Recover the amino acids of this structure.
């Protein structure tokens, strides 16, 4: 369902539309008024349409029959397609000016925000569910504004990424039970190589900028990285990977994974879990906002610390959360501190654990004396 | 194994050097309960040996000096460093002897500058407190969060300061020799940790005058002569060492500034005595002036009839030489001040050869030479040196910005000032720590010791100079911000902080004005503070505007928009804290609405007269947001106010619909009483928002319009019905049991007192027939009920007192007005 | 009280000394003038002993002033949500701004010397990146009015007096190749936050003046606490002075940039936003007229309020002149389609009755004369 | 619960009575041999007032049974020591202590 929404949502990825005309050749020609063209949502791959049951909805790409999905741009509201020119086209529509009115070319209706606002919208967020009204109000003219290539490329990257990971998740829980034994894999083959390639692309896509760079253009890469990470989290990739580690972690060892997916999928298990942890770290590294999402499931990462398949990866995720969110430290309890200390006892003398325990005490120049006392009460007197 | 083997076992070196960082972390930011514990793991002997251990690696050497500083020094140093920015100067003979320049024979306008940091300083600084680390001592019987706060573990400071000086001397000579193997592996590892230790001891004031003279010789052995061996300013140091050098010079600059302020206070000590004597003698001369004078005596007696704040203004108003006629001072006094101004400018280097000859020129040239020798890469170093350079050039301006925190006190209250500064240090130390139950009882008694401090009343300007009300306010706001959605943790502290702020407002108007400037800041944080009970954050905001016409008029309308928006939410959503206890759900929050209303009662009504601008703005906001009024007065689909009143009367009487149905919490919410009190506070607010009688007599258009709106909103008939409603009576029976109602869940006289006030101010009483119609059914049952209650038993019962106040404050003045 | 209250000689020594200290600073220290601004920048602009060094490298490591400017640009370029009040950046922005201007028939040959000395002092800064530093502090402030941005604007003007063509070229080049929308978004937010005349605040100010309340420790008669009508008038004046200086000299390259930014993704029409501020200013002026339409005499606060509102409207009109002259055809069509006509009609209506009301008496001669050059 | 073994006997005559403070150079150790406290490391005597119980029970009673100039060893049971709670961050809970007490002087 489409809405006229305001606030920070008007810089997220969900508010991006692609003008997809009806002609393949010269599809990048200038825009002339009143010429048919679909509307495509990049992150979801759906087309604006007039449906019979729910009015103005975004319908799948498999059912856009060019009649209910075509639209036109016009300068006035008077009741009025032309013959295409095999050229760059006539340039008149501009960016930041030239207020446009979108009209469904088939039914002739006009888009306008629905007037009613119920009790839920009495004080809540002001979203005005757009309806393709028969005549509509007067101030429903729309401006047209750019989005930079980084945003458009990112948005398409989420849209491509979602289908692959959703297919992977569906394959994962398809063989959740029903052990293979000595036969073949239960369902369709997992897109292992596609996923591993996608992960390595994403991990390199979120590489932090190198230290030696000039401060003038280092920061612009910080802002680019924070923007990209926020877009991915807002589109759910940060939750999608959490689902991925959730499904992969129910199998303790690679051999145990073989009994439920096959001997062909076992050798890629350790690699795919390590890459997933690295992708999680790169997604959350440096964001207060994304790191703050681990307050509700802080025990999730802590419980997985003793796992042997990727110990440094999960420790990296923990260190990225703790070095960034001062809020998370208030949720820290003695179970977690005794788990971190158990890491020192079971995984040897790893100084990165001390780099964690230093972060647990002081965050952003403010001491947390409950953590300081718990650490000194559970670590120091043993002297071992 | 030998610890020196870690110069080659770098796997253990990385782990141990991180372990020391963990030791500094767990004892960081004044965790003296832990800093004592660390003294078992690393004793005093190990640290002292590691001071002189020349073969220790780099990271372990710097980790061990910084561990010494963290364990034994930093808590005392930070607290002292905070007090370095305030100059409280007691009036003592030592203060009297303080002068800008030493007694010398160089030059009359200005002698040679003294050695900075050398001399006598009388400014107040609380002493440090330490404890001897003893792990065999009996465990205190006092429970946690009640026992006194632990002090920093003790360490011999005379030995530490001498060993530190010796190490710095050896480092300076070794650096001069250009040895291929500097201590710790590099020049940075040899000089930076030691200069950190020296800087910390200077800030703590450990070093005496002789030691400070030594340090000045080490920094520059030729400029600082009082009347190889190469100083630290010629050794081609790295960037890291330069930062500590800047911290040293910034300490000597601060000591110069404090020296100036103390000299100025001494001059004020002598100058006020002479000026007071002169003005007294001139008063005696004016006593006999009438014999030889005439009507021109007004100009000369103006000074003695002018307030002291400006008597000095005219007395000192002779700088520019074109207004001497107003100044009655003799030329010897005028030359005295015009002399002290001149050498003050000289000592600040205004106006009056590779030798710097002074600290100001030394630092300014040193900074410029460093800047133009190489592109400085450290942003903290760049900031550190340019702050110094700005201070050297703008000598006067730094004194100008240091004067507002200067203050002079009488010697009779120094030991009370000490205990004030200690409790202030306790408050300031809580800005950087997440609050826990141990710190909460630390600051409740810290505040109480300010309560019981006579200087908190005798010098209210000093508290604003120390900025105590701010530091309390951020301590409040941090706790409010933490868990600002779910529930307010630590209400037992907030109820003391709010009380302290209200006490601070009531001391004077300037204190109230200063607290008033943070009004919007308190309003934004007051959204969730209504969950707790007692003294909310909002009661501070009210206390900042009670009985102040200037503040009430200067109150921005945007703040009123904020309070009405909050009231709107209180009239549209239930209270989650009330819901969590099992209370029956109603679609609005009466308690929160009331707590906003009784604030607006203080915003619109000042000293018994309504404020027109605020009253008009309030009423035109509440009409624009009709949900503020509640379920009644809703308009379309809303029943009457009276329908709501008897509805809440029945609900309040009925158990299991008034509360959760399972005071008990000593402030248990009663929804019937909360709704009734909300309406009474709304009506009483509108009554106080009604225009005054003289405006209606003048027939002002908007005054009539506003009264018309209030009349349309609240009809007179419902008012008379509520005043006609019965009141429960304390009854005697069942073997002398003086049965009384529960005033927290019942129809109280103050609800009627709000009804009467609204009826008086809006509708009034004009004609006799309507007067008696009000009297027989609205007031007379209460008059006879209170008349009957006056016996040997009920006369002291609280509800009878409530009716006594109700009659004597709401009914009887109305009847006395309507007597004709 | 005045006849019976305590004379000075009976006060405690500490209570007298505190009063003496605060009076002394106000009358002897604040009054004191110390011109050190030029004598820092003189020292800081000298790359001393570098000629002795004779470094082969082309790079030519910066002199102290350029290092200071680089440091401030670094702390302005760093990604932070908000901007802190850097008390030294405030002190050095004021020092740099005060080290530029330094300012009955005098010869045009003397003026030919004064102009080329002022342009030298301006060149002493803008050759060291101070032009890009100003644009970065403006973009970094995110449109929050305060002494943070105000000192930056005062430096921007101080390096732009007389319309320095080099500074305007460096600024336009930096904005074009950086393609930052934060600069114009902050300018738009700053302009939208500017204040116009307030009747309600005027009445409250009048009533508070009527009370005449004083303090306890002495007495301040007719207290001069901060004006609550057009508090940020000096800031709106030097914001528009900065905007005027940007386009001064018919810099049509920059004039077309203000109207529309080609490179950026989002275009902010400064011209239209300026007009919308003029409309907000004239609405206030008209509503300040009508409340004095009944009244026959204009009192002191009313006169001072007009004096500053006229000065602000003068600065706006001068800026709108600069945006147009040259001529800039695009700007002319922008004003043609703007709300300027309604603003003009309202101003004419105010002028018609201000002339008539103010000409009846000789007490409003200065006010009328100040009104005259506005139209 | 406290056991005292001599190490180097002193006088055996003048015992620490109530009313005179005790001056000691202790050297605390955990049971496993990990030294945790000392007085010579701080390089100052530990003058504790006997009677008002400034130290733990085991240390107090052990120092009571000593003599002037005597060097002795103790063994403090957790019952007469910090016990179930221990000393937070220094001594683990339920630990038996050993002290190399030397009673160098009285007052």
């Amino acid at each position: 369902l489409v809405y006229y929404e305001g606030g920070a949502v008007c810089t997220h990825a969900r508010s991006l539309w692609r003008l997809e005309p009806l002609r393949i050749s010269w599809s990048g020609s200038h825009l002339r008024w009143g010429q048919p063209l679909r509307i495509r949502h990049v992150t979801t791959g759906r087309y604006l349409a007039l449906t019979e049951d729910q009015g103005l909805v975004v319908v799948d790409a498999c059912k856009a029959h060019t009649k209910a999905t075509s639209f036109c741009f016009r300068v006035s509201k008077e009741k009025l397609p032309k013959r295409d020119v095999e050229g760059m086209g006539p340039p008149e529509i501009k960016y930041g000016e030239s207020l446009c009115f979108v009209q469904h070319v088939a039914s002739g209706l006009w888009l306008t925000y629905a007037a009613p606002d119920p009790k839920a919208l009495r004080l809540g967020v002001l979203k005005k569910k757009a309806i393709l009204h028969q005549e509509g109000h007067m101030d429903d003219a729309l401006f047209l504004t750019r989005c930079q290539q980084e945003e458009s490329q990112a948005a398409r990257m989420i849209h491509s990424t979602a289908g692959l990971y959703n297919q992977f998740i569906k394959g994962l829980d398809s063989f959740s039970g029903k052990p293979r034994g000595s036969g073949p894999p239960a369902g369709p083959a997992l897109p292992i190589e596609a996923v591993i390639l996608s992960l390595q692309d994403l991990i390199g896509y979120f590489e932090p900028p190198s230290e030696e760079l000039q401060h003038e253009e280092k920061q612009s890469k910080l802002r680019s990285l924070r923007n990209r990470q926020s877009l991915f989290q807002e589109e759910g990739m940060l939750s999608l990977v959490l689902n991925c580690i959730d499904r992969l972690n129910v199998y303790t060892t690679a051999a145990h994974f073989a009994e439920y997916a096959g001997e062909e999928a076992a050798e890629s298990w350790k690699e795919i879990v390590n890459l997933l942890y690295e992708l999680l770290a790169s997604l959350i590294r440096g964001n207060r906002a994304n790191c703050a999402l681990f307050s509700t499931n802080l025990d999730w990462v802590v419980s997985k610390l003793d796992r042997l398949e990727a110990s440094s990866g999960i420790l990296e995720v923990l260190y990225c959360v703790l070095i960034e969110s001062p809020e998370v430290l208030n949720i820290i309890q003695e179970n977690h501190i005794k788990s971190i200390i158990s890491l020192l006892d079971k995984h040897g003398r790893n100084h990165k654990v001390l780099d964690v325990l230093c972060s647990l005490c002081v965050c952003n120049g403010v001491a947390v004396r409950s953590n300081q006392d718990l650490i000194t009460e559970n670590l120091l007197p043993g002297r071992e | 194994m030998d610890i020196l083997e870690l110069s080659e076992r770098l796997d253990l070196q990385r782990f141990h050097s991180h372990t020391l960082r963990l030791y500094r972390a767990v004892c960081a930011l004044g965790n003296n309960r832990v800093a004592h514990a660390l003294c078992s793991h690393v004793d005093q002997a190990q640290l002292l040996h590691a001071l002189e251990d020349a073969h220790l690696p780099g990271p372990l050497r710097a980790g061990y000096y910084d561990l010494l500083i963290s364990i034994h020094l930093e808590s005392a140093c930070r607290s002292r460093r905070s007090m370095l920015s305030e100059y409280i100067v007691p009036l003592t003979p030592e203060t009297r002897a303080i002068t800008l320049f030493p007694p010398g024979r160089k030059g009359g306008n200005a002698r040679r500058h003294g050695l900075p940091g050398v001399g006598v300083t009388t400014s107040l600084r609380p002493p440090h407190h330490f404890s001897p680390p003893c792990f065999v001592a009996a465990l205190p019987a006092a429970g946690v969060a009640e026992a006194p706060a632990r002090l920093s573990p003790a360490i011999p400071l005379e030995a530490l300061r001498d060993k530190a000086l010796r190490m710095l001397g050896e480092a300076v000579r070794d650096g001069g020799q250009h040895a291929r193997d500097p201590v710790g592996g590099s020049v940075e590892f040899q000089f930076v940790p030691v200069l950190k230790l020296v800087s910390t001891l200077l800030v703590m004031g450990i070093f005496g005058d002789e030691d400070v003279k030594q340090i000045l010789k080490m920094i520059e052995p030729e400029v600082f002569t009082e009347e190889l061996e190469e100083g630290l300013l010629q050794m081609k140091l790295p960037e890291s060492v330069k930062l500590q050098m800047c911290n040293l010079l910034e300490y000597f600059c601060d000591q110069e500034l404090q020296h100036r302020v103390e000299s100025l206070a001494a001059f004020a000590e002598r100058y006020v005595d002479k000026l007071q004597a002169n003005q007294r003698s001139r008063y005696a001369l004016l006593m006999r002036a009438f014999t030889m004078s005439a009507a021109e005596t007004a100009r000369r007696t103006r000074e003695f009839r002018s307030p002291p704040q400006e008597q000095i203004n005219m007395l000192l108003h002779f700088k520019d030489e074109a207004d001497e006629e107003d100044c009655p001072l003799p030329e010897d006094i005028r030359q005295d001040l015009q002399d002290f101004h001149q050498d003050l400018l000289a000592h600040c280097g205004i106006q009056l050869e590779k030798k710097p000859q002074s600290l100001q020129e030394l630092v300014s040239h040193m900074v410029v030479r460093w800047a133009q020798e190489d592109y400085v890469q450290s942003p903290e170093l760049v900031r550190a040196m340019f702050s110094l350079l700005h201070r050297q050039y703008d000598g006067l301006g730094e004194l100008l910005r240091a004067l507002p925190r200067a203050y002079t006190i009488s010697p009779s209250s120094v030991e009370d000032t000490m205990s004030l500064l200690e409790c202030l240090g306790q408050i300031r130390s809580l800005l950087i720590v997440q609050m826990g139950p141990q710190e909460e009882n630390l600051m409740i008694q810290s505040i109480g010791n300010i309560m019981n401090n006579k200087v908190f009343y005798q010098h209210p300007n000093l508290m604003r100079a120390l900025g105590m009300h701010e530091t309390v306010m951020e301590v409040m706001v941090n706790v409010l911000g933490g868990g600002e959605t779910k529930e307010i943790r630590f209400p037992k502290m907030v109820t003391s902080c709010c009380r302290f702020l209200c006490y601070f407002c009531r001391i004077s108007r300037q204190n109230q004005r200063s607290m008033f400037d943070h009004l919007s800041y308190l309003l934004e944080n007051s959204g969730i503070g209504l969950g707790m009970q007692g003294s909310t954050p909002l009661d501070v905001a009210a206390a900042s505007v009670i009985d102040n016409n200037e503040l009430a008029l200067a109150l921005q309308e945007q703040d009123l928009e904020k309070v009405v928006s909050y009231l709107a939410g209180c009239g549209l959503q239930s209270c989650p804290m009330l819901l969590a206890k099992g209370y029956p759900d109603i679609g609005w929050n009466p308690c929160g609405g009331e707590r906003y209303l009784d604030f607006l009662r203080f915003a619109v009504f000042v000293n018994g007269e309504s404020v027109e601008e605020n009253a008009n703005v309030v009423v035109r906001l509440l009409i624009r947001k009709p949900e503020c009024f509640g379920p009644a007065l809703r308009g379309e689909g809303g029943s009457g106010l009276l329908a709501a009143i008897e509805e809440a009367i029945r609900i309040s009487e009925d158990p299991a619909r008034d509360g959760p149905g399972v005071p008990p919490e000593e402030n248990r919410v009663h929804l019937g009483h909360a709704i009734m009190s909300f309406y009474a506070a709304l009506i009483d607010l509108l009554g106080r928002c009604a225009p005054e009688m003289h405006l209606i007599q003048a027939g002002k258009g908007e005054a009539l319009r506003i009264r018309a709106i209030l009349r349309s909103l609240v009809p007179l008939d419902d008012l008379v019905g509520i005043i006609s409603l019965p009141l429960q009576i304390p009854t005697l029976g069942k073997d002398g049991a003086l049965v009384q109602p529960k005033m927290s869940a019942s129809f109280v006289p103050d609800h009627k007192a709000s009804m009467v006030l609204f009826l008086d101010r809006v509708y009034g009483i004009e004609n006799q027939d309507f007067l008696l119609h009000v009297l027989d059914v609205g007031f007379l049952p209460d008059m006879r009920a209170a008349a009957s209650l006056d016996t040997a038993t009920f006369s002291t019962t609280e509800m009878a007192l409530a009716l006594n106040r109700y009659l004597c404050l709401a009914v009887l003045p109305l009847i006395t007005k309507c007597a004709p | 009280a005045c006849f019976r209250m305590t004379p000075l000689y009976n006060l405690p020594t500490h209570r007298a000394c505190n009063m003496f200290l605060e009076s002394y600073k106000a009358a002897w220290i604040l009054t004191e003038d110390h011109s050190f601004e030029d004598r820092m920048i003189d020292d800081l602009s000298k790359a001393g002993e570098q000629e002795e060094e004779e470094e082969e490298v082309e790079e030519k490591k910066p002199d102290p002033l350029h290092q200071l400017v680089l440091h401030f640009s670094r702390t302005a370029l760093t990604e932070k949500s908000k901007l802190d009040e850097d008390y030294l950046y405030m002190a050095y922005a004021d020092i740099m701004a005060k080290s530029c201007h330094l300012e009955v028939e005098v010869s045009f040959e003397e003026k030919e010397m004064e102009k080329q000395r002022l342009l030298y002092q301006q060149s002493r800064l803008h050759t060291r990146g101070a032009a890009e530093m100003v644009l970065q502090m403006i973009s970094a402030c995110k449109g929050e009015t305060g002494a943070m941005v105000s000192s930056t604007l005062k430096l921007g003007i101080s390096i732009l007096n007389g319309g320095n063509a080099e500074v305007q070229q460096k600024m336009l080049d930096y904005l074009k190749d950086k393609k930052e929308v934060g600069f114009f978004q902050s300018i738009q937010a700053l302009m939208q936050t500017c204040s116009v005349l307030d009747l309600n605040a005027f009445e409250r100010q009048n009533k508070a003046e009527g009370l005449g309340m004083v303090n306890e420790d002495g007495t301040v008669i007719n207290r001069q606490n901060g004006e609550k009508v057009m508090a940020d008038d000096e800031f709106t004046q030097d914001l528009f002075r900065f905007l005027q200086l940007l386009c001064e000299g018919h810099n049509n390259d920059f004039q077309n940039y203000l109207r529309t930014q080609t490179g950026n993704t989002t275009t902010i029409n400064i011209i239209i936003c300026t007009v919308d501020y003029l409309l907000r200013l004239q609405e206030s002026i008209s509503d300040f007229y009508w409340y004095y339409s009944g009244k026959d005499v204009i009192e002191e606060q009313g006169k001072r309020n007009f004096s500053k509102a006229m000065s602000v409207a003068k600065q706006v009109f001068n800026s709108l002149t600069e945006y147009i002259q040259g001529p800039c055809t695009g700007n002319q069509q922008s004003l043609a389609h703007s709300r300027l006509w309604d603003a003009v009609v309202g101003f004419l209506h105010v002028f018609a009755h201000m002339m008539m009301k103010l000409a009846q008496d000789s007490s409003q001669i200065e006010l009328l004369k100040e009104l005259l050059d506005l139209q | 619960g406290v056991e005292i073994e001599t190490i180097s006997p002193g006088d055996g005559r003048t015992f620490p009575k109530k009313g005179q403070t005790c001056v000691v150079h202790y050297t605390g150790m955990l049971q496993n041999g990990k030294k945790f406290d000392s007085s010579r490391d701080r390089n100052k005597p530990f003058k504790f007032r006997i009677g008002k119980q400034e130290v733990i029970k085991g240390f107090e009673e052990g120092a009571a049974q000593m003599s002037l100039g005597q060097r002795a060893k103790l063994t403090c049971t957790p019952d007469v020591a910090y016990g179930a709670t221990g000393h937070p961050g220094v001594i683990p809970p339920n630990a038996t202590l050993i002290f190399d007490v030397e009673l160098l002087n009285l007052e």
Remarks:
- Chains C and D do not touch (no CB pair under 8 Å).
- The first helix of chain C runs from residue 13 to 29.
